[PDB]
Structures are given as structure tokens and as C-alpha cells.
Design a protein around this ligand. Structure first.
Ligand SMILES: *[C@@H]1O[C@H](CO)[C@@H](O[C@@H]2O[C@H](CO)[C@@H](O[C@@H]3O[C@H](CO)[C@@H](O)[C@H](O)[C@@H]3O)[C@H](O)[C@H]2NC(C)=O)[C@H](O)[C@H]1NC(C)=O
Ligand SMILES: *[C@@H]1O[C@H](CO)[C@@H](O[C@@H]2O[C@H](CO)[C@@H](O)[C@H](O)[C@H]2NC(C)=O)[C@H](O)[C@H]1NC(C)=O
Ligand SMILES: CC(=O)N[C@@H]1[C@@H](O)[C@H](O)[C@@H](CO)O[C@H]1O
Ligand SMILES: CC(=O)N[C@@H]1[C@@H](O)[C@H](O)[C@@H](CO)O[C@H]1O
Ligand SMILES: CC(=O)N[C@@H]1[C@@H](O)[C@H](O)[C@@H](CO)O[C@H]1O
Ligand SMILES: [Cu+2]
Ligand SMILES: [Cu+2]
Ligand SMILES: [Cu+2]
Ligand SMILES: [Cu+2]
Length: 499
């Protein structure tokens, strides 16, 4: 919709996506924010204009472009105090980056504190004119993007540290809460006889969602920006920050069908049309579906997903057969999460700025014990053993700057070194199953890259580490614009009540 070159204006505004009015952070007047789009090869120049006025939801901001490698533009990645200081209120900041080697479904969100939960999140699509899946569908446009979100009546800083589920699930920005069971539902329109590439984007800040459409099956063709072989499913459990493209054939009777996105906790089920939207065939009356849900008999399993094209797994086909193996031991003490004994606290000098200032070893980099220095041009294996020591499972972990092979998925004891799916957000499963979700990637991208749980409340409690990749080359590889250099002095000159 907007972009590749566009202004994104950030403001606080009253919204009522479920009929309950509340102040939120909005992008060009709306939450979820508008669709940002371009084509593979494009240069994006997204001018983020911070016109925020509300300290409780943060007057400063920083935007992450989720799933993009940002090779040579690490300064544009978004995480506050990792890749930049926040943009200050009354200022604007230009994110200027290219997407030469990626296409698919992405999203964008605040990467400052828990601000994205308050509304600053939207979908982001990069189209491929030669899409290898093009023959599988007829329609792929603004109207085929489906966003899912958790929505809270109380602002992120004002409610419990770890909320017990959302008030409403939003599908394309609308949904029902208990407080109003007649609130307007989203309608997704289809013309009978056409095949649609639906790009399902989880903008969720906590809960995962089990997504299904009554009377319709789905063909998964994309997994977080990576093209997959066509997998036929009748439901999709989608974790916070994940994306899927699925093909829906609009081949059923002209009618209204329930679209369902059932959260893992909170207000579960569908009483009064909560957790729901409407699939309306052209010509069907403007009423609610009366369709019934059927048991999922072909649910998505991550182990069933494989890349469309042969994609080699980094390293060699054996446990720890990589250049560097890292294990992440989780802890939690009631308020903070710890990875290998360290709870992440953002440094005063952003990690990138520290590196540009000469800090190139784990010893010199802050915060102490949260930064992992990675050798260049190397295969890396990271395991995330599920433990009851860290409540809140299943934790979806996200690695910035990279896609990774999921060598072992949640619910599986298999190590797949041949043809596992590659993605950027992975469920780390549950301790009950003794899960030990393990990933692999190559260090082809100099810069500090965040690695964290994407449940934003957990990130906020410190559930994060930094992967500092090829530190001696970072400065040369990612030359920084004057505006970026100006962010920290400006931010540090703010009255704390204007932050
Ligand atoms: C800054 O943004 C915050 C967070 O969105 C706003 O906080 C809001 O603060 C008011 C209290 O002034 C809360 O009002 C309570 O509202 C409920 C629901 O309507 C009502 O039943 C209570 O009697 C009471 O009025 C409100 O819940 C809270 N908002 C959220 C989303 O947590 C604050 O108002 C904003 N500042 C400005 C100047 O707009
Ligand atoms: C979606 O996929 C499911 C699962 O394959 C299909 O369910 C089969 O449906 C036929 C015809 O109604 C029955 O004979 C079988 O018993 C069903 N199999 C199972 C395991 O449930 C369903 O038909 C598909 N729906 C559409 C609209 O294509
Ligand atoms: C990355 C990592 O921690 N690898 C460990 C290794 O240290 C240990 O020798 C082995 C046996 O427990 O398990 C694996
Ligand atoms: C509930 C609880 O014990 N909270 C503590 C908190 O006071 C402390 O600041 C933090 C340090 O990492 O560890 C945790
Ligand atoms: C609970 C569990 O299985 N933890 C394992 C750990 O022992 C091993 O070091 C690592 C690397 O293989 O994978 C994880
Ligand atoms: Cu993200
Ligand atoms: Cu990301
Ligand atoms: Cu988590
Ligand atoms: Cu992140």
C-alpha cells in the first residue's frame, strides 16, 4: 500500500477495534499500521516521523523491519540500544535500506520497550515478479493480507507485567471482546472461482493463534519469508511474529464462512463471535456466518514444511558439527528472564555505536555477559532447551539479520540435517515434551543482531542476548548516515518525561 519510499507518521490516538475506546500508538492514523510494500531489489526509504505526545506509551520510538537481513545497513534494523538510540518526539528519522535478495511476507513494529503492544505494528510485503509459486494462485494484493493481533484494554505499562491473555483477538484490525458482542467484525471478500494468496501475519505481542477457515483447506507456500513446498493443511498454529502464505481456493458455495484465530490463553473459543472474522463470497448477504467448526484433521506440523528449492543446512550432519555451538540456558525469577545467567538490560550506548567506537570483543561490549561474539563466515548452532525454570512456554525465539534452518522443531526428537524448513521465528516448545529446539545459520552478515523471545513482555523482562557478528568488519560494512549519528545525542538530551 505505502512505500517503498514513504512517510510513516507516528501519533497517539483514540481507537476502538473491538468497540472499546482507548488511546493507542498509531501509524498514519491507524492500528494495525498500513501495509508497507515493495518488490525484491527495491530500496526502501521509510521516513519515520515521531509525533508522539504520550509518555506512558513512550514519546520516543524505534522501528524494526522484521525478517530483513539489513546487510550493510545494520544501523537501520530497529532494536533500541542495539542498533540505534530511539527517535525523539518532534523528530523524524529515515530508514534507508535495500532488499536485494529477499521476497515474501514480513512486518514492522516498534522495537522500543513494549510499545508495539500499544499499537505500533503493521504488515510489510515484498513481492517477487517471478514468484515461483505464481502458478498456484490468481489474486495477491492489499486485500489478501490477514493480520492477527492481541488487543488489550489496558496499556502495556499500566496492566500486569505479564498479562493473562488479550481482551480481544483482532483479525485485520477488528474483533470482539466480552464487553460488546455486536462490535463490527472484519470481512475478507473473495470471488468464487478464484485462488487467493493469503499472507497471514502474526502481529501478536504474547499469545499464539490457531488459525482456520470453516469449510476451506489451505495450501502453505511460504514460511516466514521462505518459499516452501506446497503443504495442504486445515489449520495453522501461528506464533507471535511468524508469517505464512497460504493459498485458498474460493470453490465453496457462495456464502459466509467463519475465519477463526483461537488464542492459546485468554478468552478462548468463539462465544459471541470472539476470535473471529468473516469470509464472505461476492454475492452472499451482509450477515454473520452460521458455519460450524470441524475438527482439524490435517493441522500444520513444522517438521512437514520443507523449502521449495534445495537449501543446504549450515555445517555437517551431526550434533555440534558446526564451527560454533551455543546453548541457551533459561531462568526466570518472577519479574526477569535470564539467558545463561544474564537478564538483558539495554546499554546506555547502543551496541552498534559501541562497536563503531572500537568495542569488538565480548569483554569490551556492554551489557557484560549478554553479548556473544561470532566468527565470520562460520556455521553456528544454537539450542534452546525448554525448561520449567522459564514459565511462559512455548517461547517463540527470533534471530535478527538471518534466516535459520530449524534442524529440530518443537514436538519432535528428529534432527533434520537434509531438508528442514528455514525461517526467522521458531517456537521453542515445552518442557513437558523435553523439547530442545535447535537452529543453524551462517555468519554472512557483519553487525550486532538481537536474539530474543518475541513475546514482547518477556523481552521487556530481559529475555534476550546479542549476537555480535564479524565485529572487526562492522564499521566498514555498515557506514552510518549523519541522522543516525545524531540520534543518541538527541535522545540523551531529552527530559526523561519526554522519553
Ligand atoms: C496516555 O496513554 C495512556 C495509556 O493508553 C492513557 O492511560 C489511560 O489513563 C486513564 C486514566 O486517566 C485510564 O482511564 C480508566 O479508563 C477506564 C476505561 O475507560 C475507565 O473505566 C476508568 O474509570 C478510568 O477512566 C485508561 O484506562 C488508560 N488507558 C489505557 C489504555 O490503559 C492516558 O490517558 C494517556 N494520556 C492522554 C493525555 O491521553
Ligand atoms: C479439506 O481436506 C480434508 C482432509 O483431507 C477433506 O476431508 C475428506 O473429505 C472427503 C469428502 O468430503 C471425505 O470422504 C473424507 O472422509 C475426508 N477426510 C478426512 C480425513 O476428514 C475435505 O474434503 C477438504 N475440504 C475441501 C473443501 O476441499
Ligand atoms: C553447545 C553445548 O552446550 N554443547 C553440549 C556439550 O557441551 C556437551 O559436552 C554435550 C553433552 O552434554 O552436550 C552438548
Ligand atoms: C521478583 C524478583 O525477585 N525480582 C528480581 C528483581 O528485583 C531484580 O532487579 C532482577 C535482577 O536481574 O532479578 C529479579
Ligand atoms: C535438555 C537437553 O536436551 N539439553 C541439550 C543439551 O544437553 C545439549 O548440550 C544441547 C546441544 O546439543 O542441546 C540441548
Ligand atoms: Cu519482530
Ligand atoms: Cu526481527
Ligand atoms: Cu518468552
Ligand atoms: Cu527483535
Amino acid at each position: 500500500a505505502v512505500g517503498p519510499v514513504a512517510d510513516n507518521t507516528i501519533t497517539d490516538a483514540a481507537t476502538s477495534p473491538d468497540g472499546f475506546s482507548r488511546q493507542a500508538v498509531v501509524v498514519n492514523g491507524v492500528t494495525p499500521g498500513p501495509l508497507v510494500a515493495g518488490n525484491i531489489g527495491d530500496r526502501f526509504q521509510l521516513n519515520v516521523i515521531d509525533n508522539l505526545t504520550n509518555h506512558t506509551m513512550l514519546k520516543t520510538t524505534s522501528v524494526h523491519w522484521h525478517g530483513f537481513f539489513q546487510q550493510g545497513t545494520n544501523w537501520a534494523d530497529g532494536p533500541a540500544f542495539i542498533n540505534q538510540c530511539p527517535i525523539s518526539p518532534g523528530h523524524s528519522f529515515l530508514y534507508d535500506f535495500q532488499v536485494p535478495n529477499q521476497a515474501g511476507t514480513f512486518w514492522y513494529h516498534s522495537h522500543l520497550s513494549t510499545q508495539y503492544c500499544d499499537g505500533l505494528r503493521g504488515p510489510f510485503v515484498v513481492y517477487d515478479p517471478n514468484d515461483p509459486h505464481a502458478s498456484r494462485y490468481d489474486v495477491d494484493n492489499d486485500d489478501t493480507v490477514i493480520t492477527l493481533a492481541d488487543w488489550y484494554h489496558t496499556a502495556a505499562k499500566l496492566g500486569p507485567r505479564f498479562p493473562a491473555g488479550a481482551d480481544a483477538t483482532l483479525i485485520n484490525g477488528k474483533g470482539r471482546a466480552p464487553s460488546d458482542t455486536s462490535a463490527e467484525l472484519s470481512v475478507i471478500k473473495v470471488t468464487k472461482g478464484k485462488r487467493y494468496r493469503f499472507r497471514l501475519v502474526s502481529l501478536s505481542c504474547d499469545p499464539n493463534f490457531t488459525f482456520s477457515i470453516d469449510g476451506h483447506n489451505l495450501t502453505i507456500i511460504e514460511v516466514d519469508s521462505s518459499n516452501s513446498q506446497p503443504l495442504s493443511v486445515d489449520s495453522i498454529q501461528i506464533f507471535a511474529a511468524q508469517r505464512y502464505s497460504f493459498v485458498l481456493n474460493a470453490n465453496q458455495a457462495v456464502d459466509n464462512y467463519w475465519i477463526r484465530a483461537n488464542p492459546n490463553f485468554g478468552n478462548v473459543g468463539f462465544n459471541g463471535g470472539i476470535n473471529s472474522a468473516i469470509l464472505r463470497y461476492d454475492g452472499a448477504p451482509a450477515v454473520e456466518p452460521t458455519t460450524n467448526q470441524t475438527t482439524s484433521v490435517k493441522p500444520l506440523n513444522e517438521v512437514n514444511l520443507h523449502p521449495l528449492v534445495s537449501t543446504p543446512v549450515p555445517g555437517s550432519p551431526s550434533s555440534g558439527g558446526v564451527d560454533k555451538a551455543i546453548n541457551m540456558a533459561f531462568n526466570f525469577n518472577g519479574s526477569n528472564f535470564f539467558i545463561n545467567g544474564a537478564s538483558f538490560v539495554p546499554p546506555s550506548v547502543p551496541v552498534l555505536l559501541q562497536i563503531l567506537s572500537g568495542a569488538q570483543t565480548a569483554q569490551d561490549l556492554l551489557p557484560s555477559g549478554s553479548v556473544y561474539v561470532l566468527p565470520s563466515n562460520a556455521s553456528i548452532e544454537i539450542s534452546f532447551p525448554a525448561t520449567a525454570a522459564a514459565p511462559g512456554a512455548p517461547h517463540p525465539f527470533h534471530l535478527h539479520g538471518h534466516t535459520f534452518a530449524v534442524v529440530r522443531s518443537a514436538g519432535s526428537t528428529v534432527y533434520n540435517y537434509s531438508n528442514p524448513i528455514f525461517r526467522d521465528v521458531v517456537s521453542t516448545g515445552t518442557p513437558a515434551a523435553g523439547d530442545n529446539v535447535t537452529i543453524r545459520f551462517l555468519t554472512n552478515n557483519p553487525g550486532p543482531w538481537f536474539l530474543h523471545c518475541h513475546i514482547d513482555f518477556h523481552l521487556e523482562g530481559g529475555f534476550a542476548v546479542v549476537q555480535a557478528e564479524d565485529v572487526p568488519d562492522v564499521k566498514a560494512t555498515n557506514p552510518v548516515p549523519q541522522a543516525w549519528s545524531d540520534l543518541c545525542p538527541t535522545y540523551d538530551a531529552n527530559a526523561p518525561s519526554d522519553q
